[PDB]
Design a protein around this nucleic acid. Structure first.
Ligand SMILES: [Mg+2]
Ligand SMILES: [Mg+2]
Ligand SMILES: [Mg+2]
Length: 110
RNA sequence: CUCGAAAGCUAUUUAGGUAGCGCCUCAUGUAUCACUCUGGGGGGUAGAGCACUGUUUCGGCUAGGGGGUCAUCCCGACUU
């Protein structure tokens, strides 16, 4: 609603744009370069004018409310085909080819 | 010589005792009473019924738990 989500205050611009969930850190360094907003000032000190140009960039990359939708179909395409990358992805095993006998605990919990 | 019962009720340290009412008798009064016919009158019993509360048999049409279950990593449902 503010830029797609709420944006914190009393912070620099590149840090503030990070919470938009679809722009990391290197991408938000291009947006202040392409628009011209100084990151060295806070978001409080800005004008209420050029935020549309920041909002123009949000309408060109992705939005987290639909980013998580479309990335699920990338998962969902892998599951319903029954390919090996979606075979373990149904179950909960690691995917990229890690070791399974021990230590793969961030995909199985405590 | 004339008339003629009861073994009921309530209470009881009561139950085989006793006391009030019900039933007999003799007096005094006073006027109602039985039987039957024609009336008016409420009722919930025998019977009967399944509208309620329950209980019972068969049949259909089914909701379902799904019983099978094509069975789908895990999801459709195949089938009945
Ligand atoms: Mg006699
Ligand atoms: Mg005695
Ligand atoms: Mg009867």
């Amino acid at each position: 609603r503010i830029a797609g989500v709420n944006i914190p205050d009393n912070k620099h611009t590149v840090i503030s744009l990070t919470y938009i969930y679809g722009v990391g850190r290197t991408t938000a360094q291009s947006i202040c370069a392409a628009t011209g907003v100084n990151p060295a000032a806070k978001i409080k000190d800005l004008s209420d004018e050029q935020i549309d140009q920041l909002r123009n960039e949000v309408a060109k990359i992705t939005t987290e409310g639909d980013l998580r939708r479309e990335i699920n179909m990338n998962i969902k395409r892998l599951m319903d085909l029954g390919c090996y990358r979606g075979l373990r992805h149904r179950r909960g095993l690691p995917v990229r080819g890690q070791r399974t006998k021990t230590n793969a605990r961030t995909r199985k919990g405590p």
